[PDB]
Amino acid sequence: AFPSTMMDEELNLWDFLERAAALFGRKEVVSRLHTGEVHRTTYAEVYQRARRLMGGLRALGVGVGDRVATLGFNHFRHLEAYFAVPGMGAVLHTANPRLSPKEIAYILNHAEDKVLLFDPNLLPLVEAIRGELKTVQHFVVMDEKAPEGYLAYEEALGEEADPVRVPERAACGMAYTTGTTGLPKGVVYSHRALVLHSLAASLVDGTALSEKDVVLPVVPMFHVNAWCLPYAATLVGAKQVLPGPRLDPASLVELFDGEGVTFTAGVPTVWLALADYLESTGHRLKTLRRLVVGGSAAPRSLIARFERMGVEVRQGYGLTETSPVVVQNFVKSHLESLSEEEKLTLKAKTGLPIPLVRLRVADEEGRPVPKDGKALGEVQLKGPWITGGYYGNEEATRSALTPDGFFRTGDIAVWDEEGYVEIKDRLKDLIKSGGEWISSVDLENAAVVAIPHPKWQERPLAVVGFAKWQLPDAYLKRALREQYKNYYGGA
Amino acid sequence: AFPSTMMDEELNLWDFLERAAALFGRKEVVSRLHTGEVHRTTYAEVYQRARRLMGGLRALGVGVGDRVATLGFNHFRHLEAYFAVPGMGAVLHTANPRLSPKEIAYILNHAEDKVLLFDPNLLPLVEAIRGELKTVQHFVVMDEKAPEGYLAYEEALGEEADPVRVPERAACGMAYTTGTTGLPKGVVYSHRALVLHSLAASLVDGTALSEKDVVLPVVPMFHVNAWCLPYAATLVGAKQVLPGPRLDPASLVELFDGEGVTFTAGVPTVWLALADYLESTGHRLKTLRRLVVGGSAAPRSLIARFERMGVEVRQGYGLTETSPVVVQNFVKSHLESLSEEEKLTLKAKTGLPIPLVRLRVADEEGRPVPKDGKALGEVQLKGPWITGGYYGNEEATRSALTPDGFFRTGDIAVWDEEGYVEIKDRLKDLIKSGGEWISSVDLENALMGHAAVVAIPHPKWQERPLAVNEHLLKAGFAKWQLPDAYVFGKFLKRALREQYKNYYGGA
Numbered sequence: 002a003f004p005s006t007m008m009d010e011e012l013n014l015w016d017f018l019e020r021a022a023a024l025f026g027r028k029e030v031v032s033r034l035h036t037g038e039v040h041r042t043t044y045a046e047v048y049q050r051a052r053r054l055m056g057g058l059r060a061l062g063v064g065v066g067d068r069v070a071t072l073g074f075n076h077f078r079h080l081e082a083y084f085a086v087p088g089m090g091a092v093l094h095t096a097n098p099r100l101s102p103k104e105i106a107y108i109l110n111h112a113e114d115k116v117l118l119f120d121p122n123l124l125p126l127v128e129a130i131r132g133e134l135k136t137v138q139h140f141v142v143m144d145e146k147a148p149e150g151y152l153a154y155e156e157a158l159g160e161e162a163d164p165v166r167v168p169e170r171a172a173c174g175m176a177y178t179t180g181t182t183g184l185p186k187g188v189v190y191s192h193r194a195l196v197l198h199s200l201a202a203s204l205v206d207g208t209a210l211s212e213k214d215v216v217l218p219v220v221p222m223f224h225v226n227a228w229c230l231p232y233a234a235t236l237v238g239a240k241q242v243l244p245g246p247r248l249d250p251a252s253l254v255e256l257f258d259g260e261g262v263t264f265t266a267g268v269p270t271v272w273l274a275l276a277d278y279l280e281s282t283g284h285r286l287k288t289l290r291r292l293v294v295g296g297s298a299a300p301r302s303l304i305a306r307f308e309r310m311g312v313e314v315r316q317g318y319g320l321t322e323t324s325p326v327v328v329q330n331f332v333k334s335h336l337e338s339l340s341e342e343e344k345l346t347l348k349a350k351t352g353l354p355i356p357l358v359r360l361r362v363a364d365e366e367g368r369p370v371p372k373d374g375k376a377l378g379e380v381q382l383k384g385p386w387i388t389g390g391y392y393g394n395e396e397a398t399r400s401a402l403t404p405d406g407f408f409r410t411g412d413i414a415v416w417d418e419e420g421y422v423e424i425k426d427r428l429k430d431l432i433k434s435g436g437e438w439i440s441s442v443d444l445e446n447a448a449v450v451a452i453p454h455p456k457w458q459e460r461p462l463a464v465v466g467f468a469k470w471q472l473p474d475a476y477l478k479r480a481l482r483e484q485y486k487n488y489y490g491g492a
Numbered sequence: 493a494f495p496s497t498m499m500d501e502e503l504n505l506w507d508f509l510e511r512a513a514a515l516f517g518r519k520e521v522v523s524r525l526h527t528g529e530v531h532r533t534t535y536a537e538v539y540q541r542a543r544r545l546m547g548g549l550r551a552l553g554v555g556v557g558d559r560v561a562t563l564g565f566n567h568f569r570h571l572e573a574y575f576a577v578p579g580m581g582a583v584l585h586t587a588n589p590r591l592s593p594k595e596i597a598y599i600l601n602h603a604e605d606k607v608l609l610f611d612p613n614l615l616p617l618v619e620a621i622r623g624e625l626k627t628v629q630h631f632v633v634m635d636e637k638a639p640e641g642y643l644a645y646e647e648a649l650g651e652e653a654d655p656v657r658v659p660e661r662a663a664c665g666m667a668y669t670t671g672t673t674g675l676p677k678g679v680v681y682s683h684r685a686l687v688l689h690s691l692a693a694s695l696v697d698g699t700a701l702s703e704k705d706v707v708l709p710v711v712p713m714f715h716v717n718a719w720c721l722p723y724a725a726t727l728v729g730a731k732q733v734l735p736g737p738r739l740d741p742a743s744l745v746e747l748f749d750g751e752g753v754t755f756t757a758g759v760p761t762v763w764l765a766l767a768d769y770l771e772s773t774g775h776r777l778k779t780l781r782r783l784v785v786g787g788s789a790a791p792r793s794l795i796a797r798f799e800r801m802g803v804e805v806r807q808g809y810g811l812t813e814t815s816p817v818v819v820q821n822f823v824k825s826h827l828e829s830l831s832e833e834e835k836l837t838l839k840a841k842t843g844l845p846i847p848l849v850r851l852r853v854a855d856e857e858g859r860p861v862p863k864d865g866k867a868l869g870e871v872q873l874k875g876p877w878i879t880g881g882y883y884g885n886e887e888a889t890r891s892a893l894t895p896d897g898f899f900r901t902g903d904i905a906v907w908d909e910e911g912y913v914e915i916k917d918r919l920k921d922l923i924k925s926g927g928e929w930i931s932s933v934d935l936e937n938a939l940m941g942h943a944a945v946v947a948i949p950h951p952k953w954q955e956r957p958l959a960v961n962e963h964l965l966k967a968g969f970a971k972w973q974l975p976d977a978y979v980f981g982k983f984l985k986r987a988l989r990e991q992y993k994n995y996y997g998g999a
């Protein structure tokens with residue numbers, strides 16, 4: 002009825018790196034490779050090489066809408082792909098190398114990826130599944146060199162190409178979740194979604210990302226695009242430190258101090274191992290100020306450990322389906338007067354719903370449950386970076402949403418008058434161990450319950466195909482969980 | 493189109509207030525009214541009353557796309573209108589009461605405003621222009637009571653109504669710029685533009701707005717929606733302190749200390765009056781940490797004075813056409829090792845282009861000028877909250893754009909290798925005095941009816957007219973527009989500007 006005079010300028014992920022190259026071109030991107038060697042590059046060079054990757058991928062037959070898959074850890078070549086693939090209007094499919102060969106083959110075949118980029122230390126896995134892949138036309142090793150039948154990344158680079166412009170709602174990337182019963186389910190992100198997510202999650206009450214920050218994502222670049230951190234860090238022009246596959250405490254500490262890391266993010270298991278190490282050696286990190294924990298619930302103790310060592314811990318919550326961040330923990334101004342015990346309890350809560358997210362905790366018919374911090378309901382979400390369904394799966398799509406169009410997370414929670422959310426349970430019958438999913442059912446038909454664990458956070462226990470980490474440690478369900486609550490003895 | 497699975501949810505300004513009510517509902521909104529009295533409300537109450545305002549305006553015949561105008565200063569009722577009008581799918585036209593009666597009547601008629609909300613102290617102005625208005629059906633006084641022929645705001649409130657959602661690219665508000673030749677030109681903002689602006693401008697390297705902040709916008713709610721600060725403050729759930737028309741230093745200090753203000757934003761003239769006050773009294777602000785100066789260039793000495801008191805000063809730049817923020821000043825990490833003097837100089841620069849803004853300093857063909865901090869060119873912009881033209885004016889629209897689609901600001905600048913912009917000059921021939929525009933041409937062409945009017949640096953105001961009185965007042969000019977001094981086919985102005993550079997003693 003009344004048009005605005007505003008320009009119809011589309012949101013695009015390439016604009017982050019373009020701005021980084023122009024304003025913060027000398028800012029460093031530091032990578033530790035699988036061999037332990039440390040590689041140094043900058044935003045200016047990443048931008049140049051990302052343009053070369055766009056031209057190289059075009060020469061390999063990649064066009065707008067085509068899927069280019071990755072199987073790799075956090076390093077500069079993965080960051081170059083993060084921009085080049087969406088930059089040419091293609092779809093960045095981050096695949097998880099920790100999954101079974103059968104699961105990876107299914108996901109790559111379902112997405113119909115045209116090109117696969119993968120780390121050299123993952124060649125045995127690629128050689129193992131290669132014969133099962135039906136769409137992959139080119140296999141690119143993310144390294145200087147590649148063996149027979151394989152193409153090296155440095156060889157695959159072509160002439161510099163200009164980025165391709167698309168409507169912001171077009172696909173930029175995709176990822177499959179294994180936190181579900183049956184087959185993996187695909188979620189397709191858009192430029193619009195990930196740009197908005199990068200902005201809204203990086204505010205002061207969120208990750209508070211600044212140009213002066215040095216950012217180390219411990220979360221894998223195959224876990225919801227490392228929680229969108231590589232994009233958000235580029236947007237502000239922060240120095241990035243990409244740790245690679247080595248996530249042992251001594252390796253991380255070396256990077257924390259050596260590179261002057263100020264901000265980091267990862268799953269609870271990595272931080273528990275890090276805290277164990279810092280406490281045993283009496284070593285205190287010389288620059289680290291902020292740490293976010295996500296993927297699973299952070300134990301109250303984990304927060305108390307780091308706060309004692311001078312590290313601020315902020316819980317984050319989300320799903321593959323939500324890009325991922327929908328909830329972030331910070332202490333409200335008027336709640337700073339709470340006692341140290343009360344404040345620790347508050348920090349141990351999941352947190353507050355972030356900007357541009359409509360969150361509710363509701364029952365079976367979509368009715369919100371009372372805000373008393375006691376009543377249980379399902380977390381339900383609506384927003385521009387929240388999925389409205391799945392790719393190529395009609396039954397998963399129609400069971401994903403409520404009648405009034407809210408996405409159903411499958412997580413049971415409470416919420417209070419202050420607006421704080423607390424994940425308490427899960428509708429979905431699954432085990433999450435060290436930030437990776439195990440299906441109870443698949444182990445059964447071959448009763449399996451999730452039992453709390455100190456180090457990881459849940460471990461399979463059976464009652465009387467698969468990888469060694471999936472194996473149940475020891476040999477109506479709301480009873481066996483409460484009965485064997487302390488089998489693995491974890492607080 | 494390999495389809496994304498992401499929800500097709502629109503960006504809407506109402507979402508800021510709905511979130512504020514749900515999560516930060518007890519956070520305060522404090523206003524000083526025109527009488528000096530202090531009013532106290534909360535986000536929850538503002539939310540509830542804004543729903544009543546939507547219901548009330550609907551009963552008055554306001555529909556989707558209709559324009560609702562305001563003529564008022566910073567207070568809770570203006571904030572309620574900031575959300576209710578866009579929340580019902582209508583268009584909030586923030587009008588400037590400092591303009592001439594002829595200018596205000598023109599913009600209200602041009603925008604075809606249906607309802608006018610105004611401050612009680614601006615009643616004489618509204619009464620003076622009422623006969624000139626052709627579209628305004630309802631006149632609402634933003635107060636508890638109203639005289640005959642006028643509706644009181646509290647009376648105008650109706651039943652609580654649910655918000656209406658419009659396409660994000662549709663209009664949420666509009667404002668007219670007087671920083672142009674001829675009649676004022678209208679800029680129409682979208683929900684999408686202002687939501688994105690609020691997000692991108694509020695990052696750590698920007699205003700760094702937080703729930704813990706106490707925000708005091710000295711910038712008027714008719715100056716590009718108070719630089720979008722009432723929206724961004726609501727977004728983060730910060731406490732808001734709205735000073736009203738009383739912007740004198742004593743009145744502000746009471747609010748700075750009494751309410752625990754952490755963040756503030758305004759024009760250099762207001763901050764110069766504050767610095768003079770604090771220095772002359774020896775009074776020190778107890779809570780103020782951050783101060784942004786915009787609208788005009790912040791003098792190097794102004795920044796030093798506040799930094800000497802522990803207040804961080806960050807320059808911001810924009811236009812009515814740009815929502816307004818496109819450039820913000822902050823010191824890059826690797827330049828923190830610069831000396832005190834060098835850092836103060838860097839802070840005096842306009843700053844760095846902010847996220848989602850494509851900025852260039854370009855020549856006449858649209859080619860970027862060298863990044864040596866010497867070569868002059870025009871600041872040209874592209875982005876989702878930058879205007880692509882003007883409302884109901886084709887000529888002005890086509891003259892505001894380059895062939896490749898960049899908006900022409902009319903600002904002459906230099907830029908360096910670090911990306912820092914410095915505004916040096918203006919193509920447009922106007923005077924900006926205390927944040928308000930004076931047309932040199934309108935002053936010249938009037939005078940010659942019986943001349944060359946140029947902008948000269950001023951200590952207090954930022955520029956004052958010098959002509960190279962009664963006749964000018966009769967042609968429709970106010971006291972503040974009159975040139976301070978007179979000294980006895982276009983005009984070669986650069987020479988007169990350089991010759992009389994220090995005429996109004998002090999650059």
Ligand SMILES: Nc1ncnc2c1ncn2[C@@H]1O[C@H](COP(=O)(O)OP(=O)(O)NP(=O)(O)O)[C@@H](O)[C@H]1O
Binds near residue numbers: 225
């Ligand atoms: N902060 C948290 N507290 C409690 N549970 C969490 C938290 N964050 C995530 N979860 C759980 O983890 C689930 C999301 O897992 P998932 O979709 O696999 O994302 P991810 O762990 O970040 N890795 P990815 O699968 O690549 O997206 C949620 O549904 C929650 O059950």
Ligand SMILES: Nc1ncnc2c1ncn2[C@@H]1O[C@H](COP(=O)(O)OP(=O)(O)NP(=O)(O)O)[C@@H](O)[C@H]1O
Binds near residue numbers: 812
């Ligand atoms: N930080 C700054 N430094 C130098 N000049 C500035 C700065 N900010 C604004 N300007 C000038 O002011 C012009 C914008 O004026 P204008 O469109 O009136 O915005 P505004 O004064 O902030 N809001 P409003 O008074 O409602 O129009 C720009 O074109 C610049 O010439």
Ligand SMILES: [Mg+2]
Binds near residue numbers: 179180321
């Ligand atoms: Mg999931």
Ligand SMILES: [Mg+2]
Binds near residue numbers: 670671811812813
């Ligand atoms: Mg203007």
